[PDB]
Design a binder for this molecule. Structure first.
Ligand SMILES: Nc1nc2c(ncn2[C@@H]2O[C@H](COP(=O)(O)OP(=O)(O)NP(=O)(O)O)[C@@H](O)[C@H]2O)c(=O)[nH]1
Ligand SMILES: Nc1nc2c(ncn2[C@@H]2O[C@H](COP(=O)(O)OP(=O)(O)NP(=O)(O)O)[C@@H](O)[C@H]2O)c(=O)[nH]1
Ligand SMILES: [Cl-]
Ligand SMILES: [Cl-]
Ligand SMILES: [Mg+2]
Ligand SMILES: [Mg+2]
Ligand code: NA
Lengths: 361, 359
């Protein structure tokens, strides 16, 4: 429609992630419970870097919010600004500086109506991850006979979320009950702060097994790639430090997931020119093999010169190893189980979940 | 110190471009018979935040940053060494290049500062400078030493350890340095651990209730329930199960004992908080861990926060006490009752005097 928000409800949801912010404007209608239906993305804009990486002063906040919002084709609508793991790495005292400046920016203008601007927990983010994916799969309308699990592979945290009946023995913070479209859904949620790709990588930059042969490690040693070896190193951070296996595997053993979907960074890796997967799905076995043979075991100078257009390339041995460590050695997923990934051209994040669910923990 | 010292002595500028900020130092010095610097004195300094690697590298932001760092210095017509450390080492060379190409251009557009080097140094180079700087200040370089001095630099993104060790052909050449200064031959073991600096390592423990004061609000919505011995075991898993600190350092330190330990970097800021009780600018790991456990881990966060409201790092003190013990005792193998000297934090001592001595 010419102006969609004249005939439908519209809100703006901003995903303020660790590596960038994404504005989405959604139009929707509501059913007879006032629940959104027919959700359509009418605009998006993605900027970098992340909000938490900028200096929190009025000039810098204005430049950033102007870049994010000023060219939108629709305004005069409510805005939800929800920041994720990049902000969670800062204490409340530091985050307050950002929100006081952001709140002032919104008060000083008239085109957007700020409703909320806050850092959400990783558990809230995980609920939104599951809602957004399941909305896109059309699995929310009716009671499913299949369990759908979602993983969001972010830059600073990763989330996992799947159906699990309410359990008096698990923290209330890791369990969510919602009623949507007249069904009652109970989920386990967990986020692992520091296990996102950027933050994790900072522990392995001097691991020769994690980089192509002769890659120049920052300590002056040479890469000598070997994905199974790098995977074992990353598993030590997953399990000896974060205890991912002990927290997740007993729960998935009791609440098996029939279909896994992943969003976040893994879509970019799996879709890159170095990897080959069909049907927008992968297995961990194939992901680790491809990284091992196409990056880890190659000569870095040669490979870098072959693929000059990919600034992410140098990390692909490490990332393929890390995803396997996280999914197989941490979550316990079978290396041969299909993991669907949402094509990156969709730019799909968790923001549709906010449209559907306005509460937070 | 003279009026206009650089009109009367040789001067150089050394910039420590660290992960949390950049520090310009200008040193005047005389030279001995071998044209080696002596009488090194800091005649200016300026510290800015954030780190150079944290900015977006384009001509506008680089200009603003270097202007902020340099413009008000009292003399500009001197050699400059710009050495970045672990914040830049977190980035691949292709990304670093953007920063140095802009930096180089900026220096070429002006006609006073004489840029000699602008580069990222390795953790091993940084460790050498750490040792030189601390030993210069202790006055132990002029003559051969009755004792072994070890230096630790507890930075934001990496930590360094450095101590005397005869050459060992079984150990990487990268972890050993031989130098001759003031006519003496010195052999050092050097190592840096990227990712084990305080800021970087803290990002793995923010949701660990044992690492924060009681009722501190963790990012996941749970509450702090501090216990320093439990938090220390979590950090030790990162030191040893992930980075293998103990396997790399302990066998060498056992055979090349250090008589006196000195530390620069974060530990000086922590140890100087009035929550702690230390004397003579020194501590032991056992005392640090016990004091963090009692004064922070097991106290109510609201009480502490209201008592020290000026102190932006307070909330981390249970974690930091635990982390320093995990790194020094469980990682390096230092006895927990061994004295660790810390340079008083008001000195703001970094490794930059090492560059004056080495270049
Ligand atoms: N291979 C590749 N990776 C990309 C590309 N663009 C972004 N990434 C990486 O994908 C990872 C996941 O990114 P994303 O899910 O957007 O993270 P985020 O939402 O910013 N972080 P968080 O959710 O933790 O706050 C990030 O480390 C990012 O650095 C690309 O073009 N290619
Ligand atoms: N406890 C405490 N820590 C502080 C204070 N001010 C700064 N720090 C922290 O002390 C640590 C060491 O800082 P510094 O030595 O300047 O690190 P750097 O040189 O910027 N980093 P690097 O050497 O790894 O490149 C950092 O993690 C910094 O965030 C303070 O007042 N108290
Ligand atoms: Cl290094
Ligand atoms: Cl969280
Ligand atoms: Mg995200
Ligand atoms: Mg430093
Ligand atoms: Na980190």
């Amino acid at each position: 429609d010419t102006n969609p928000c004249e005939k439908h409800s519209c809100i703006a949801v901003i995903d303020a992630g660790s590596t960038g912010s994404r504005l989405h404007i959604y139009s929707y209608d509501t059913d007879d419970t006032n629940t959104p239906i027919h959700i359509e993305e009418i605009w998006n804009k993605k900027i970098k870097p992340g909000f938490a990486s900028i200096q929190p002063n009025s000039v810098t906040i204005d430049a950033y919010l102007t870049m994010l919002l000023a060219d939108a084709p629709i305004h005069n609508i409510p805005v939800y600004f929800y920041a994720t793991a990049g902000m969670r790495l800062l204490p409340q005292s530091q985050q307050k500086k950002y929100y006081d400046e952001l709140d002032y920016w919104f008060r000083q203008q008239s085109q957007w109506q700020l409703v909320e601007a806050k850092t959400i927990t990783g558990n809230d983010e995980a609920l939104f991850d599951w809602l957004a994916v399941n909305y896109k799969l059309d699995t929310l309308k009716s009671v499913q006979n299949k369990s759908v699990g979602v993983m969001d592979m972010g830059g600073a945290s990763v989330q996992i979320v799947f159906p699990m009946p309410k359990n008096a023995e698990i923290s209330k913070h890791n369990q969510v009950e919602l009623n949507i479209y007249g069904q009652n859904i109970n989920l386990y949620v967990h986020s692992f702060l520091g296990l996102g790709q950027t933050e994790m990588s900072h522990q392995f930059l001097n691991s020769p097994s994690c980089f192509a042969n002769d890659y120049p490690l920052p300590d002056g040693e040479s890469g000598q790639g070997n994905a199974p070896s790098c995977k074992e190193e990353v598993t030590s951070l997953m399990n000896s430090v974060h205890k991912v296996n002990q927290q997740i595997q007993p729960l998935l053993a009791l609440n098996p997931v029939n279909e896994w979907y992943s969003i976040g960074g893994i879509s970019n890796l799996a879709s890159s020119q170095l990897f080959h997967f069909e049907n927008s799905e992968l297995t961990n076995q194939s992901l680790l093999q491809q990284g091992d043979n196409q990056i880890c075991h190659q000569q870095w100078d040669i490979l870098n010169g072959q693929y000059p257009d990919d600034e992410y390339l140098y990390q692909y041995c490490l990332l393929s190893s890390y995803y396997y460590a996280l999914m197989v050695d941490g979550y316990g997923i079978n290396p041969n189980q299909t993991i669907h990934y949402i094509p990156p051209e969709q730019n799909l994040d968790w923001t549709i979940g906010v449209v559907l669910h306005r509460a937070l923990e």
